[PDB]
Subunit: 30 residues, 4 copies
């Protein structure tokens, strides 16, 4: 079922959760 | 089929805009 | 012509070139 | 003939590994 489309996407969402922790640079470092 | 293709890309604009605020750190440099 | 599939990846490569700037994150330490 | 869909998923694996590199920046700080 066109698993090719879901595979990339799946990683796409995986990056967001990682983003929040990375944002801490901004918050802290004004 | 459920819009799998657009569903993933939808988030993409989010990651793009969030990117800019990141660079904001290098400014002060320190 | 399923422009959705081709147009969405475009951003994908755009992030890689910007990525290298991040190296500056630790370049200044120790 | 241009597997765009699979083309993205192939790149991401590259991002995931470099991604952790940032974590040095924050952890040390907090
Ligand atoms: C880069 C990402 N938004 C995707 C990855 C794959 C190719 C394009 C459509 C869809 C699946 C999402 C672009």
């Amino acid at each position: 079922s066109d698993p090719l489309v879901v595979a990339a996407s799946i990683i796409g969402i995986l990056h967001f959760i990682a983003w929040t922790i990375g944002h801490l640079n901004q918050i802290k470092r004004g």
